[PDB]
Structures are given as C-alpha cells and as structure tokens.
Design a protein around this ligand. Structure first.
Ligand SMILES: [Mg+2]
Ligand SMILES: [Mg+2]
Ligand SMILES: [Mg+2]
Ligand SMILES: [Mg+2]
Ligand SMILES: [Mg+2]
Ligand SMILES: [Mg+2]
Ligand SMILES: [Mg+2]
Ligand SMILES: [Mg+2]
Ligand SMILES: [Mg+2]
Ligand SMILES: [Mg+2]
Ligand SMILES: [Mg+2]
Ligand SMILES: [Mg+2]
Ligand SMILES: [Mg+2]
Ligand SMILES: [Mg+2]
Ligand SMILES: [Mg+2]
Ligand SMILES: [Mg+2]
Ligand SMILES: [Mg+2]
Ligand SMILES: [Mg+2]
Ligand SMILES: [Mg+2]
Ligand SMILES: [Mg+2]
Ligand SMILES: [Mg+2]
Ligand SMILES: [Mg+2]
Ligand SMILES: [Mg+2]
Ligand SMILES: [Mg+2]
Ligand SMILES: [Mg+2]
Ligand SMILES: [Mg+2]
Ligand SMILES: [Mg+2]
Ligand SMILES: [Mg+2]
Ligand SMILES: [Mg+2]
Length: 49
RNA sequence: UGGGCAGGGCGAAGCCCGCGGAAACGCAGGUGGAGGCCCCGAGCCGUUCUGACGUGCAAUUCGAUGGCGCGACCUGGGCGUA
RNA sequence: CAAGGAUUGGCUCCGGGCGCCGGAGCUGUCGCUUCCAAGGGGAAUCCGACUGUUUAGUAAAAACAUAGCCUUGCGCCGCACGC
RNA sequence: UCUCUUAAGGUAGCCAAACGCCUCGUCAUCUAAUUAGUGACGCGCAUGAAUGGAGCAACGAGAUUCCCACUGUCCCUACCUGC
RNA sequence: AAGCGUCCGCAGCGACGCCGCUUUUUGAUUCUUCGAUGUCGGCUCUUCCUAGCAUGGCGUGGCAGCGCGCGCCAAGUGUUGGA
RNA sequence: ACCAGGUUGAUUCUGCCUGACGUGUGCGCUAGUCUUGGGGACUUAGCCAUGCAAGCCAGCGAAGCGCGGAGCGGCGGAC
RNA sequence: UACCUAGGCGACGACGGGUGACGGGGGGUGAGAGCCCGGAACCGGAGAGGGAGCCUGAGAAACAGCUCCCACGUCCAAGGACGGCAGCAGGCGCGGAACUUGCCCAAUCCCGGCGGGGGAGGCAGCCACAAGACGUCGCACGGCAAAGGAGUGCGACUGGAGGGCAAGUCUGGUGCCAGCAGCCGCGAUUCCAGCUCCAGGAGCGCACAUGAGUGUUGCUGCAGUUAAAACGUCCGUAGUCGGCCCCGCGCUGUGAGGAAACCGCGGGGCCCAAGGCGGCGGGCAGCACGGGAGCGGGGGCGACAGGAACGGACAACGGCCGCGGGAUCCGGGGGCGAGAGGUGAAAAUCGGGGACCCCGCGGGGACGGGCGGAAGCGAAGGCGGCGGCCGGGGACGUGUCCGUUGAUCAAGGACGAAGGCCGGAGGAUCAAAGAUGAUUAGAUACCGUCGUAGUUCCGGCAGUAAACGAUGCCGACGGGGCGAGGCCAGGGGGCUGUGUCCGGGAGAAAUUGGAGUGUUUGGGCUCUGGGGAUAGUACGGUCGCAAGACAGAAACUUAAAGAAAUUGACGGAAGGACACCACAAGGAGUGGAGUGUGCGGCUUAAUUUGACUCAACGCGGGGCAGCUUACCAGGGCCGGAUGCGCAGGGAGUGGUGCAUGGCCGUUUGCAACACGUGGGGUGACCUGUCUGGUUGAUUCCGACAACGCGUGAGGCCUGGGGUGCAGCAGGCUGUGCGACGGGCGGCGGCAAGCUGCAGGAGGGCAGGCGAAAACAGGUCAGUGAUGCCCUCAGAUGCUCUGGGCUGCACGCGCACUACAAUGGCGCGGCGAGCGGGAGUGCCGGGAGGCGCGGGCGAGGCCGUGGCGCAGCAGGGAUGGGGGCCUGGAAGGGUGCCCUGAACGAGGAAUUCCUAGUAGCCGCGGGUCACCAAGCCGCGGCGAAUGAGUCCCUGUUCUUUGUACACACCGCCCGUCACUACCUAAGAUGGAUGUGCAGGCGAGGAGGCUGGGCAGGCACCCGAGCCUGUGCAACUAGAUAAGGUAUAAGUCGUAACAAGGCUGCAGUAGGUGAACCUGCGGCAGGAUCACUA
C-alpha cells in the first residue's frame, strides 16, 4: 500500500515555527523600503538575495 | 392421330410523349402484354380433420378443409415394351 | 394484398372523357363486399433453390425430378454444340 | 519449443445443428415459471467442403418457436335444429 | 449403543454390526400365454391400502409463547392451477 | 503592428504544445475606508408554505347616526 | 370553398436536419482585416405548469379572466372545494453558480374626473461580483419618508524563488519514496518547512470559456518536389474568369431621413478619479442628387487566343488482316554409350527401357533479342519483327476560312498497368496456392525441383499503383553553353518538342527555367493539407458478381512525429593502408600428466579483501608460522583530547574509486590534436588538417581557398658497438670524432622517397620521455591526501595470545619438472656476465658448526666409464625414519636413507616469437630472520623461417549508406499473455423528444331549435387519449473484434547497413507472428557511368 507511504512521509516533516514578527511595512512604505536598496547598488546586475 | 381446360390480378421487353441533360443518358405518364408469375372456375388431386363410414354407399367411398388448375398437364383411339 | 388505415346501403341530383367514373345532397334505430362469395397477420429457425413428381389402398416429405455445375467413354454413332 | 507416428493428419467454414454420448452442456434472450425456440460458446462421443461446405432472396398443404388478433381448445358447460 | 447433542448414550439423532418386512423399483428365473391376453404416457372415471400429507383426538420434547421435532389412535373427508 | 520555452550530439526548418495579455463565469485564500454599479440568465420555462403585488371614481346615492358610504353605474386591470 | 390550368422552388444551396438560437441597439478582443459574444438597462417579439377554446372589451385568444383536458399539489364533515411566485421577498430542489419573508410612496412615474393605490419604483440590508478613489471608539451637527452613511465637530495577504520568468546552487527533513511541476523538468537550487528574497498588492491565485498570440484558417495573408497536402488521365455543364479598336448599369462623392443608452471627441476642480451633466460626431451596398472614368448594346479587327482548311513531311499512335522470326517446351526418328540435372555444397529427378549431348522432322502456345538511346509517339495507362487496310495525331508552312467561338472546373461521362473476377477459347514458358529436396536452433521463407490458379486471346466487370516529375491546368515575362527530334529557311536562322551543364533568382536545405518574377505579399480556375497517433479504420451512403472501391470521422490517447543537412559511430558496403594482442613460412609451446602459485566454488569460528574480455586470475612489488593482517575465538589497554553527564574533536585496512586528489593502466605496440587570420555555408560545421605519391609518423613531396603556426612525430636523452686525444691504474673515465641515408645503379621526378651494391665497426640496435581527448578502468587496503555516511567503551580503536589468509568432491589462469639414448648417472679437463664485501683454518658423511678474517664465479661443454629402450640408473610425485638451520614459536628451508605415483608426446582449442632473437641453460638482484618453481636483470649455447600478404583476427583511412547518437550489446515491428479505458459490431431490447396519418373524443363561439337561463341537432375550432409510422437523439446486452495505455513477460527479428533475400506501395494468395510469395510498377537504390 503506497498510501501508507503518503501520510508518514508527510509526518516526516519537522515543524520549525515562525520567528518573532518584525511587522512588515506595507504599501508605498515598502516600495520605498525596497527603493533604498535599489539606490545602494548603482543601476545594474544586482544580487538581490 | 384426335380432344379438353372460367374469370380476374401483377405488368417484362419493345414503343409513344413529356420533363431534365453538353453528352452519355436519367426520371415521369401512357402503351404493350412477357412469365414452368399470382388468386381462382369447370375439372383434377388427396393436406388436414388422424371427420363420416369402418359385416360400409364403397374389397378406399363420402363430407368439410386444402392443393393444383394452358401444363414437365389431362384425355379417347391406334401402336410399341411381357 | 407486406404491415396498417379509411370507405362501401337506399334515394335524388350534378359533372365527365358516359358499358363507366367522380362529386354533392337527402335518408335508416350506425347500417351497407347487409345473402352469397371472399387472404388472418407479424418476428424468426431448420430443410429443399424454384414450378413440378411420388409410395392406386397408413408416408406428398427434407425424398425424387430439375436447371446449373462437374467427371467419364466414344471419330465404326443419331457424328462431339453429338450420343 | 521438443518428440512419436501417417498416404495425408480436418484447411476455409459451420455447430449441443435433422449431425453432441455425457446433456435438460454453459452463457444470454424469451417466460411468473421453458428438458422447448433463438443468439452465442466449441478439445466437435462421431461437423466439414460436388460422399459437396457455407448461404435463405423467392418459393413450400414440409419441420419448429414466439407475438398480435381470434375463438367452446379449455374454465364449464348449457340451449336449439335436422337426421 | 461407539459417538453426537452446552453437562447429558437414548429430547432428537446414531456409527460399526445384526434381524426382519414389502412387492409400489430392477433383476433372477422361464411356470402360464406365440392357431396373438393390443405394447408407453395422458385424458376420463370409480374403488382400495396405510408405511398418516392435511383435517380430529392425544402423548412427548433440548415444549415460555409463536413455531418446530418425535411418537400414538384413526383410512371419514381431502390432496390443486401451470412453464 | 513583439515573442519566449519545448523534437537534435549539435544545426536549419516544418510543426504543434506551452508560457506571456485582455475579457466573464465559478472556486480558493485574504481583507481597512468611501462612492458607484451589479447580482437564481446558463443546470430545473423545476416545485412552491405564508404575506403582498391593480385598483379607482365626481353619475345614483341605501343602511347606519345632514353626515355617511353600500351596491349599481363608470374607468383601468391588454400598461 | 367551388370549378379549372400545371405549375412553384433548387448547387446564386431549395428541401430536410441541427442549434445547451429570442433578435437588435450593442459588448469583448485585436494596429487592422477579422474572430467571438449579446441572459442581462433601451427597443421589438414570445410566454405565464403543458394545451386548446372563449367571454367581456376600443384593444386579450388575457391567464394575480373564464371553460375544459393533461401532468403535479392541497382542503373536506367524503356530499364537494381548490392551487398555479418565468410579479416581490422567502423556502426546497437543482447545480460550479447567484441576496432581506427589511422600510416607504419621499424621489421617478403610472391607473383613477381629486383625497387613493402601486413588492412598478426608490431607500437600506447581503455579497471583494465589478469599476473608482484612499489607509495600515462616543456626543452635538448634518442629511434622510423614516433610519443609516457622506460632511463638520470634539475626545497584509496572495503566489513564487531550475529555465520560460523577477527572485536562494542558505537551513532542517525527505532519498526515484513522498511529492512537485501549464511546457521543459527535479528527486534536492524544483519535494515539505524555516528564513530571506521576488511579483502584484486590499487584493491575489486557480479552473473553464473566448480573443490575441497564429500568415496554425490565411480577403488582406499561408502551405501542397522531399516536412501534412495536386485527385491516374481526358472530356465536361452549372459556377467562376475572360482578346483588341470604336441611354442603361455597376462603382463612387455629397446630402436627406435615421431614438436614447452606448462609443469616439470635447468640455467640465463631483476634494481627485470612475462620474454626473451639457456640446459634437459616427452608424445604413435602402432613398435623392452629382460624377470626366469602367461595363453593356452595335460595328471594325483577326490575338505568338481558339476552331476549321490546306501543303509537303513526320510518327514503337490505335484497330484489324496477312506474312514471318528464332528461342523455351513436348512428341518422334537416328547417332553416341554413362551419366545428366541442379547447387555455396548436395539432395530430390531422369538415366542400358539408351538419358544428357548431336542432327533432322513435327506440334503448340507465348514472345519480338541485337539495333534500342536520358531517341520517337500517345491524354494518361501505354506503345518496338514485316507488309497492307481503316482510323487518328501533333509540330511546321501559308495573304486559306470562321471571328472570340475561350480558360478552368462541382455534377456527370469516357479511358485506365499489374493482380483480380465472370463467360468462352487456349495452355509453351514462368508461376501465387499446394507439394516436395535442402538450409536452419527453428524456416510455414530465402535456394533446388514440381505444380494449380494465373500468365495468353475474345466479350465484359473491376477501377487500383511509388498510376511519380512524389511537382494540377491555362497564361505573361525571364541568362549563357552543349546535345542525337520534327518542320521551315538557306545568313553558327526561325518555330516547336526534348534532355543536359553553368549562373541568376528562389529555398530550411537537398536542390531548382520554375520549386523564378512573394512581406516590394493580388493573372485566372480547380483540388488538397492544418501536430502525432487513432486511421485511410468505423458508421451511414453510392458503386461492384465478389475482392473491394469512392468518400470519410469520432471517443480514448500523445509532446512530439516529421523534413533537409552536419559531425560522429556503425555496416554480414566497396576500395585502401598496416601489425608476429594478425596471418602466412617457421621455431618452441600451452591446454594432457604431477607439482608450485593465483582465481572461483564449496567448506569453515574464520577460510579478510580488491580486481573478472584484451585492460581480473606468480597482480595488489600479496614468497602470510607471530607481526604483516583487514578475518575468527578470546584477554588486556583507552592516543574517550578539549568547553560548562553533555558538547565536540580525534581515531577506524569500516563503507563509497559511481563523491575525490594524486598516481597508474588502457585507447598506444597509436598518429593524432589545435590555434591565429581568411574563405564556403543562414547554420551546425567544412576548408586549413588534401586528389595522388611517400613515411613507423597529419613524415614529407606536391596539387591546392587557403596562409602562417603549435603540440605530438622527429629533433631529443641513456646504454651499446669503432677510434682521436687526454688523465690514471676481469683496467678505469673524461673529451671528442664517426652515419647523414651520404655515395653509386635502377624506379619516381620540382619530387618526397623506395630499392640493390660498394665503402664501413655500424645502414629499421635496446631503452627513455611520450600530444589532445576520453574510461563512471583500478587504487579510500601507500598516505599526517580526503568529502560524506557509519562506529567509538561490551569499540568497527590499539595491543597480546591462538587460529585462519596455506581449509578441498570440483572448475580455471600462469609457470615448474618431465615423459628419457640429441638421454641419465660417475669421475677428469675447460669454464660467463650482471653483480665487484668474503673468504679462510678446524670439526663433520652431508646439511651444518666453530675460530680468525680486505674480499667471489654457473649450468654446461669436452674427454671418459657404467646403464642400455626397459615405466628402466627416465620421471621424482607421495610417504616413513633420522640429522640440522632460522625463529620466541615450524606447516618454512636444508641434508641423509628409504618408499618410486601419474606421465610412453598430450582432445577441442590457444599463446609467444624475425638474430645473438626464439628456445635451451644457469646466475645475480628486489621481496628476505628463514624461504622462488615468481619477478626484474644478466650472460652461456644458439637456431628455424618470411624479407611477405590482408586470407583469419584486429586498428585505421577514403568513398558510400544509415530510421543509430547510451551510438549495432543500437534502433525497432508484430503476434501471444495480464490489467485498464474507449469506440464500432452484436440475438434481444429499453426509454425520450418531435412530426405525420387514423380512431375515440372533453369543452366551446356562432347557427338551427327548444318545458326559450334547461335540453336537443348539424357545422366549426379542438385539447386529451389510443394505434400505426417517419425523423432526431440516448441506452442495456451474452458474445466478439479493434484501438490506446500498462511493469514490460514470452516468441521471434520484418525494417534501419547490400539490416544480412535491396526497400517500398499496389494486387492476389498463404503463414503463429512480424511477414512471405507471385505479377506489374517505383527509386524514396546498393547504378546519375560503356557496339559513344
Ligand atoms: Mg402458376
Ligand atoms: Mg391456389
Ligand atoms: Mg398421384
Ligand atoms: Mg392490408
Ligand atoms: Mg415478410
Ligand atoms: Mg421443394
Ligand atoms: Mg399412400
Ligand atoms: Mg450449385
Ligand atoms: Mg476447424
Ligand atoms: Mg433451452
Ligand atoms: Mg411454449
Ligand atoms: Mg474435396
Ligand atoms: Mg457429411
Ligand atoms: Mg410444390
Ligand atoms: Mg384378441
Ligand atoms: Mg382383452
Ligand atoms: Mg432556446
Ligand atoms: Mg438580448
Ligand atoms: Mg508529403
Ligand atoms: Mg534416341
Ligand atoms: Mg488488366
Ligand atoms: Mg488478368
Ligand atoms: Mg477465365
Ligand atoms: Mg517449374
Ligand atoms: Mg461501410
Ligand atoms: Mg534524414
Ligand atoms: Mg593477531
Ligand atoms: Mg611475488
Ligand atoms: Mg532485407
């Protein structure tokens, strides 16, 4: 039965929770909070992550 | 060598005309009247009733039903085959 | 005549291409091929192709015949499409 | 695939068929119910190719089953007429 | 009466064996019939038997009831329509 | 007025698939405010409890106690 | 309705069917042409459960009116009475899918002659359904029919992070599982989470549909040689298209009239915006007016339009008649005398009953060789001896005629190879089927033999081909060259066919005078294609005697299938070249025997383990008594540091060489590899790097769209021989010289070079380094080279002891010693090189021992004595007893005596080798306490034979083929067998819609009447039911056939290479199955090629 493989390998996932939230700014504020990063690298060819 | 065998039905070729077609031809309406065609009359026969009868009308008949009914027929006489 | 349906009398007319055909009207206790005469039909199977033939007197058949198909013999026959 | 054996090993077809013993075969259909009928299936006792096989258009007083309609065949008899 | 039947041989069964009865099966035989006793089934119609299916009365149960089993007496009346 | 990925060892094609965009129908997750619009058309022109949806009047004017409002009459209900 | 005409419509698509179809204003989407949608505001239509009939009224065939029928539903006191929400809310059901049983006539309007009514309608509520704008709690005010909101007024998800596609080769889990992913794809950069990041953002994702993407529907604007696709040919009607000159209609301009919404535009500070509101526009192949051109009508030309005529030619054009040719086969005669036939080889078969062969005669059918070709003709299929008849044909020539008669085609008609079918005739060859003889693993095939249909003719059917130029017809235009057509002209000429070559242009390319004049896209007409598979299959139809033909889907399934070319690889393709992991000519062998050793297997407590074709198997320098040593039985010991029992380091001959480094092997015993620049091609690529010749060599000569370089090869380095000088003492080691293929002869000549001889010590001496690319080669067991995984105290650590690595029914590799007389044994004699350390005296029979201590030499050969063909004095295996050596320890070694095995020349197979070589023969070194039958070296003796060839194996090159690219151990086809899905068939059915026809027939208007509000009668409308039937669409079904997908199992191997029988399609038959066979085609062939 391969459905016996279906649930325990789902249950083989470890559960690592969320961090404490640095409540993320929304809207034009986030569009500025990425635009600060767009000017730090002189534009192109930017490593974003 | 003679003779016998209602009446209908279906509608084959061929033909005529109309329509269609470039042509080949195709439809349609008449005409025609073929066929071991169809229903059947006289007649013939013998399917069924396993009817009647079954010391009978009759040493095989009767009735109804049925089949055939211009034929590969039936029939008188003559003749042949014992 | 696949199956299946409608109609059908009498009378009085009208029309036609007038031995007949079509139509209309009237009429009967709805009834009309009025008696007589006169197919029951459908779906299939088996067998024999068919029409025909047969056990006169228990069998009419699927049997026999048939055309077709085939084989055989025969050039001393009726003459090979022949017997 | 191997092997034995025959003159050759049943081909195309067709079938519990009028040909199947088992057998009222098995499945389907038909029915309330079917040893029947039909359609399938085929290791077919013992189907099969002019000893003709398969095939059903048409035909049939042939053999068989179902349906419709019909009916004294029956339920279940009764009455009438002639002789 | 080995065993089964919750325990329990006999409520009801009952192996292994044994004893009978019947002439409703089929044999066995060949006594009667071959100078013929019409041979299956059905239909029809009457009667008889009981080894009793129903109906009447009972006894028994591992019979609460309902039902079912087992046994007894009794042959009066019954014992169908179909594919 | 646009292409991109995908057949191959690589190539050039044909070729279709897929991505990329709008639209409307439904689903899903999510959601602070306001304005505006839409909403049992698709399947079932399926079935319907209950209430309401088309009434009105000036002619004549009864009961009832001049007021009155019944019925007749009229108009609409076919929009 | 009565009577009478025979009409009416249709490929300009009638009629019938379908529609999950109300139409339109419009909407969506695209640059546009278009495509798609319009339930939905407004307009028109239609309906009120299905129907039908009607009353009233101006208006209804009304339905929140009536009458009846039908289907559902309700109440009843059982007599009867009712219900039609496709009105508004609301409920149920349906489904993916859609709101409150709220308030009110305040606004918009309607009915009513006003006070009234209005679920029309508005307001609010519900809903992220949509558009727009903007962020990350309670008074007063305000508005409101009323309330609430607006307006003052105070106190962050959604999806993703491999590519397309923006953003992670971070962390943990998962290990082809789970899962993810539109496509490609991943199995940890793709799963599941965390983080971070990206995208859009109060929104976002998904599914479905549609548009664009798409010039993949092509009017604009495709494609049809080979990718899917020109119908076999010709005729042919509608249709569509169509020469020149010389009032009507098309077309077109403006204008009318045409609803708003909408849309386009324009304003317009609703706070902005979407808006509101106001301007202006568009729409229509209808109408009116205008229009210089175009078309008709009618004449005139007579078209490098056509038809007709004529002329001389030309013609494998057809039909028929006649003549003829030789060959195959048969009959018959004569000769001959043993075979013949047939094959890769044979067999079957016929042969003294005279075959075969030779010669004559005869009969019969079929067939035209050579000439015969990129030559002719025909519309295609097709047409080939000769003569004649009848008929036809195109081209040419022409002041001949006609004058637009034309082009192309649905429908229709005719012809149409082979095979097939029918009837008749005939039957020589060949030959499906069938039968045999072989081949083969099998062989139903290929090969041999035989043989029926058939092949042949006549009359008909059939109507198909790779019917191909895989290329429709007509027409205009477009480069040269060479040809072997026909006619004409006479002036390397013109017409018309026909090939070919080179360019242009085109094309994805191969290629191509059309496949050109194509995004600068438009000549006409017809047909076809729209990813693959299903499938040219099914159903229906038409045709056919049948075979089948024509025509022609879908369900399900799939991300590729395909084209042309490039580079490889491969080929039972051709041609080369080369080699003792080749062969010939040879030599010695191996495999046989015993032993030594290695491998497997088995056993075992363990018999550690790597490696298994060359490139595993005396290999791991692997000759193991301990150690080595990884294994087994035990015992010790903790190199378990370090950071506050845990963390973590460290260790491991534990695992993984498919995680690696390094090294080594193999391709190699090769000759290949690459760059710079330029050229060819759209490109991958090619040239350079080569036709040929040459070389061990891609070494060079040479021609060359290449030119120059670079690795490798060579040069080189070491040893070897000859001697010049120098130095010094089994003579030693420095420095040079010496050979280069130089000279000569002959081939080849820009030659490179090859080959013989002379000269010479020497004319390919032996090694060394050794390119690029690979391989899942080997090594984690060389490593203080190592990632990762596992183990770490009862250890997979280290160490000790014992055992094993040495076990043994057996299979195998490599060697050793032999089988003897070319020998063996016993003495005497002569005796090497590498290596240069070792000898000596004494004891002992030997092995060995002891003490000093600068210090070595073999088998053999020669001479000679014995044995004397014998399992023998060959052989020395096995075993017994004794003596020693090494070591802690003998299974080790050595020595002595004795025992004395197989083996009498070794099956199929198979290795190595060309001169001081093979072989024989020892010696020394590595390993080593002890030990070599091994390895690496060394010398002694010393051949045979080729001076080659690709036969066999391989490698390599050229050309070619390829459906291979994991690269032939590849790819691939079909049956069988299992499961799943789907479609068609299928006796027997089943249910629904709809239309006809008939039967019965409720009700009802009007008329005629009446117990004059009843009832009756006839007519008319007519539901509803019943029966029969048509059409449309659906479904059950025993059985049975396909298709597709399965995990791929069995059987083969049909195709791809000459795929091992060239392939393919047609047709016919046959076979388990791909398929085989016959006939005729075709090249898409393995041939562009020969009396030139
Ligand atoms: Mg007759
Ligand atoms: Mg008769
Ligand atoms: Mg008679
Ligand atoms: Mg009749
Ligand atoms: Mg009939
Ligand atoms: Mg008969
Ligand atoms: Mg008789
Ligand atoms: Mg016959
Ligand atoms: Mg059979
Ligand atoms: Mg039966
Ligand atoms: Mg019966
Ligand atoms: Mg026979
Ligand atoms: Mg028989
Ligand atoms: Mg008869
Ligand atoms: Mg008697
Ligand atoms: Mg008697
Ligand atoms: Mg509709
Ligand atoms: Mg609409
Ligand atoms: Mg093609
Ligand atoms: Mg002779
Ligand atoms: Mg032919
Ligand atoms: Mg023929
Ligand atoms: Mg014939
Ligand atoms: Mg032959
Ligand atoms: Mg068909
Ligand atoms: Mg190709
Ligand atoms: Mg040890
Ligand atoms: Mg060794
Ligand atoms: Mg082949």
């Amino acid at each position: 039965g391969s459905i016996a493989r279906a649930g325990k390998v789902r249950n083989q996932t470890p559960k690592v929770e969320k961090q404490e939230k640095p409540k993320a700014l929304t809207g034009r504020a986030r569009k500025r909070a990425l635009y600060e990063r767009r000017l730090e690298a002189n534009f192109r060819k930017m490593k974003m992550n």
